């Protein structure tokens, strides 16, 4: 329903593209992208699904398997067929009088919802990773940098999230 795109990436001298992969529910997802890597340049992000690597289905592979496919891949370019963060949702909240939208977080994850808040009214969910805040990616940031973005934001606060 939401369409796959092809990425084409060049290996470093060790064969790497700057990518960590994770097996979830017999798919393969991007777990970590290395700063200023080819992965990064082609816009891969934590939570994107890899449907194929060099045309081969990723279905049922482990992370260890996925990584070894990358390592063994012939030539210097690697093609991947990518489905953009299929689990992603966006919630728009409004800060109240105290400057808060209404949730507790830790390690970039929503851990509780404060009663009577914009977050409560919007059905914001716990056990969910925060991906971006007002168009700022928060993946790989300390909670302090996340809190700074939150405080500096205007009243309307749009966050993207996905189930952890």
């Amino acid at each position: 329903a939401m369409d796959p795109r092809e990425v084409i990436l060049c290996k470093d001298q060790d064969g790497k593209i700057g990518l960590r992969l994770k097996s979830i529910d017999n798919g393969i997802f991007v777990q970590l992208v290395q700063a200023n890597s080819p992965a990064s340049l082609v816009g891969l992000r934590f939570g994107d699904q890899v449907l194929q690597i060099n045309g081969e289905n990723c279905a049922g592979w482990s992370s260890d398997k996925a990584h070894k496919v990358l390592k063994q891949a012939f030539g210097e370019k690697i093609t991947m067929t990518i489905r953009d963060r299929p689990f992603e949702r966006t919630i728009t909240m409004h800060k109240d009088s105290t400057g808060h939208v209404g949730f507790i977080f830790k390690n970039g994850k929503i851990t509780s919802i404060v009663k009577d808040s914009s977050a409560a009214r919007n059905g914001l969910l716990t056990e969910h990773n925060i991906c971006e805040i007002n168009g700022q990616n928060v993946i790989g940031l300390k909670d302090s940098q996340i809190a700074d973005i939150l405080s500096t934001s205007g009243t309307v606060v749009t966050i993207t999230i996905m189930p952890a």
């Binding site: 808060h100 939208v101 209404g102 949730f103 507790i104 977080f105 830790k106 851990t111 404060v114 977050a119 909670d143 996340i146 809190a147 939150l150």
Partner: peptide, 4 residues
């Protein structure tokens, strides 16, 4: 820990 951190309140949003």
């Amino acid at each position: 820990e951190f309140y949003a």
